[PDB]
């Protein structure tokens, strides 16, 4: 209702919504959900300090996850390795041949 008569007839095209050229998709890597934007540098509080330095927590957790996954893969490979290296002359081979003969 606060429009001059010459601008009210073409108000739609004139102003519109030009925020999309800098706003991003909410389900994207660039989006911040209005909670981490207004962080304060936390001196006395350790959790506030971690929240302010969350990228250090991020890459520390990335390295921890990578080493945990490598540990899981190497334990599985070691189990398969032990099962495959357990085979020898004392294993259950040639016994059926001996029984048939």
């Amino acid at each position: 209702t606060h429009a001059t008569g010459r601008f009210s007839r073409f108000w739609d095209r004139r102003y519109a919504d030009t925020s999309h050229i800098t706003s991003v998709d909410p389900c994207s890597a660039s989006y911040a959900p209005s909670e981490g934007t207004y962080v304060r540098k936390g001196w006395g509080s350790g959790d506030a300090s971690s929240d302010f330095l969350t990228y250090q927590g991020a890459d520390r957790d990335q390295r921890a996850r990578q080493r945990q996954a490598v540990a899981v893969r190497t334990t599985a490979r070691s189990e398969v390795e032990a099962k495959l290296s357990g085979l020898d002359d004392a294993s259950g081979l040639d016994d059926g041949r001996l029984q048939v003969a």
Partner: peptide, 9 residues
């Protein structure tokens, strides 16, 4: 600066 614009990381 530690305060990014709205909607941007």
């Amino acid at each position: 600066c530690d305060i990014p614009p709205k909607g941007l990381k």
